[PDB]
Amino acid sequence: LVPRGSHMDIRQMNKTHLEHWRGLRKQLWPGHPDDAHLADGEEILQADHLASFIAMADGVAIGFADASIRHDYVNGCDSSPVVFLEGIFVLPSFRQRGVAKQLIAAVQRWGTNKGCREMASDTSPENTISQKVHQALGFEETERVIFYRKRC
Amino acid sequence: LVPRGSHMDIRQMNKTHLEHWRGLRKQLWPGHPDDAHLADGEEILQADHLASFIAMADGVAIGFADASIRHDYVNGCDSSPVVFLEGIFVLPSFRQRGVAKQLIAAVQRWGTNKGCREMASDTSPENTISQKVHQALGFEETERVIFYRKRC
Ligand SMILES: CC(C)(COP(=O)(O)OP(=O)(O)OC[C@H]1O[C@@H](n2cnc3c(N)ncnc32)[C@H](O)[C@H]1OP(=O)(O)O)[C@H](O)C(=O)NCCC(=O)NCCS
Ligand SMILES: CC(C)(COP(=O)(O)OP(=O)(O)OC[C@H]1O[C@@H](n2cnc3c(N)ncnc32)[C@H](O)[C@H]1OP(=O)(O)O)[C@H](O)C(=O)NCCC(=O)NCCS
């Protein structure tokens, strides 16, 4: 069978996606231990406010997005709760083809169905590609900020 | 009575502080309507996770701080929940005297007693004075980021 190509599926990560997801995520956060990633998957799966999305193509995972629902203050946002995009990543060899586009779309649709008026997100200044992408997908830059931590 | 000066009290904003607080806050967020500020005071007062602190000096309000407890992800933080410093402001004519220092201290002590391992905060790049202050009070700059919003 050849006149076509071979479909891509954006699916919500359930437990049978845990290794595909872990595999891609190790490349978004190289520095976060396999154990850590596993812990996270468990947490995500079970939580009402956490969701992930995997973009499967011909039985393999080529991109994912990590969304959460924020009930706290959220830089540049007017309403609550907010659908935040915590992490999105598409295998190099599949970028600029609308994958992250669909992934982000499925993170919006999830957050809409969960009450969220706005889909927030964030990126690093050194991340120009990320910055552009956000703009291309209709995200408006709201504010830039510096964060601090102090132990209690 | 003269050999001394005249004590300053950092107190947690209850309802009999609502106009002193509103008065100072109008100068942190000029652009937020008196109505809005009032709404906020009500909300703060009643919520388990919201707290404010007023620095009273000789019966008048000279500085305040707005803290919240964050249960969502928090840029540059390792634990949850986090005591976030949403807003701090000290009348011009009282800065550089340790007021914000005590105010921030009382926001830490509140957030400690509420489980928080870390006290987070944030500021704008154009805010050099804020930036310095944070450093002086032992806050380490964790990360800088750009935020985005998209409607759902
Ligand atoms: C951000 C990232 C997920 C984008 O993936 P993607 O597959 O390239 O996304 P899309 O192809 O759907 O791009 C959507 C839009 O961004 C633009 N864009 C994508 N890649 C771009 C690039 N590398 N440089 C400039 N513009 C780019 C597309 O042209 C545009 O399409 P449009 O014609 O509808 O405007 C990224 O490439 C990634 O996979 N790697 C690093 C992870 C990262 O940056 N994370 C961000 C938050 S954690
Ligand atoms: C940030 C602000 C609250 C500081 O108030 P403050 O009364 O001056 O704070 P403190 O005097 O307790 O200062 C603590 C430390 O910061 C330093 N500092 C204070 N003001 C400073 C200034 N104007 N320039 C440089 N360093 C400064 C103090 O020297 C230092 O004391 P230390 O000897 O213990 O290191 C500010 O001045 C304010 O009131 N106005 C604008 C509001 C704002 O910037 N908000 C920030 C987050 S919403």
Q: Residues of B at the A interface (Cβ-Cβ below 8 Å)?
A: 68, 70-77, 83-84, 86, 108, 111-112, 116-125, 131, 134, 137-152
B142·A147 Cβ contact <8 A: yes
Q: Which two tokens stand for residue B151?
A: 């409607």
Closest alpha carbon to A142 in B147, B151, B32, B150: B147
Residues 6+ apart with CB under 8 A from A152: B83, B108, B111, B112, B116, B117, B118, B119
**Residues β-bridged to residue A67:** A51, A85
Closest alpha carbon to B62 in B20, B125, B107: B20
Cα(A32) to ligand 1 centroid in Å equals: 23
Alpha helices in chain A (DSSP H): 18-25, 34-46, 99-112, 128-136
Pairing of strands A118-123, B118-123: unpaired
| Experimental approach taken | X-ray
* Rounded CA Rg of chain A: 16
- CA–CA distance, A141 with A75 (Å, rounded to integer): 11
- CA–CA distance, B36 with A125 (Å, rounded to integer): 33
Q: Which two tokens stand for residue A129?
A: 């590609």
Q: Which long-range contacts (CB under 8 A, 24 or more apart) does A19-24 make?
A: A20/A54, A20/A56, A20/A60, A20/A61, A20/A64, A21/A52, A21/A54, A21/A61, A21/A64, A23/A61, A24/A54, A24/A61, A24/A62, A24/A63, A24/A64, A24/A89, A24/A91
- CA–CA distance, B107 with B52 (Å, rounded to integer): 8
Q: Which domain holds residue A126?
A: 1-152
Q: Out of A108, A146, A148, whose CB is closest to B152? A: A108
Q: Which two tokens stand for residue B93?
A: 């004519």
What is the distance, to the nearest Å, from the Cα of residue A111 to the centroid of all Cα atoms in its chain?
12
The resolution of the experimental structure, rounded to one decimal in Å, is: 3.0
Of all helices (H) and strands (E), which one includes residue B38?
helix B34-46
Distance from CA of A79 to the nearest CA of B (A): 10
Q: Judge contact between B58 and B25, C-beta under 8 A.
A: no
Query: B139 — phi, psi (to 5°)?
Result: -100, 140
**How would you label B22-42 residue by residue, b for 16+ Cβ within 10 Å and e otherwise?**
bebbeebeeeeeeeebeebbe
Nearest CA to ligand 1 atom 24: A129
**Chain B environment of A148 (Cβ under 8 Å):** 76, 120-123, 134, 139-142
**Chain A environment of B147 (Cβ under 8 Å):** 74-76, 120-122, 141-145
DSSP class of A55: E
Residue B96 in contact with ligand 2 by CB distance below 6 A:
yes
A148·B123 Cβ contact <8 A: yes
Question: How many domains is chain B built from?
Answer: 1
DSSP class of B16: G
Q: Judge contact between A115 and B43, C-beta under 8 A.
A: no
Q: Which two tokens stand for residue A121?
A: 């997100």
Q: Judge contact between B62 and B94, C-beta under 8 A.
A: yes
**Residues β-bridged to residue B8:** B57
Nearest ligand to the C-alpha atom of residue A63:
1
Cis check: omega of the bond before B92, within 30 degrees of 0: no
Looking up residue B69, the CATH number of its domain turns out to be: 3.40.630.30
Task: State the number of CA atoms in the 13 A half-sphere of B146 facing the CB.
Answer: 16
**Residues β-bridged to residue B9:** B56
Q: Judge contact between A111 and B114, C-beta under 8 A.
A: no
- CA–CA distance, B43 with B37 (Å, rounded to integer): 10
B123·A145 Cβ contact <8 A: yes
In B32-139, the DSSP E strands lie at 50-57, 60-70, 82-90, 118-123
- CA–CA distance, A83 with A32 (Å, rounded to integer): 24
Strand order in the sheet with A82-90: A8-12, A50-57, A60-70, A82-90, A118-123, B140-149, A140-149, B118-123, B82-90, B60-70, B50-57, B8-12
Q: Out of B73, B120, B152, whose CB is closest to A149? A: B120
Task: State the number of CA atoms in the 13 A half-sphere of B61 facing the CB.
Answer: 22
A124·B145 Cβ contact <8 A: yes
Q: Judge contact between B150 and A137, C-beta under 8 A.
A: yes
Alpha helices in B47-124 (DSSP H): 99-112
- Is B90 annotated in a binding site? The answer is yes
- CA–CA distance, A122 with B149 (Å, rounded to integer): 9
Q: Residues of A at the B interface (Cβ-Cβ below 8 Å)?
A: 68, 70-77, 83-84, 86, 108, 111-112, 116-125, 131, 134, 137-152
Q: Which two tokens stand for residue A43?
A: 């947490």
Pairing of strands B60-70, A118-123: unpaired
Neighbours of A95 (CB within 10 A): 15
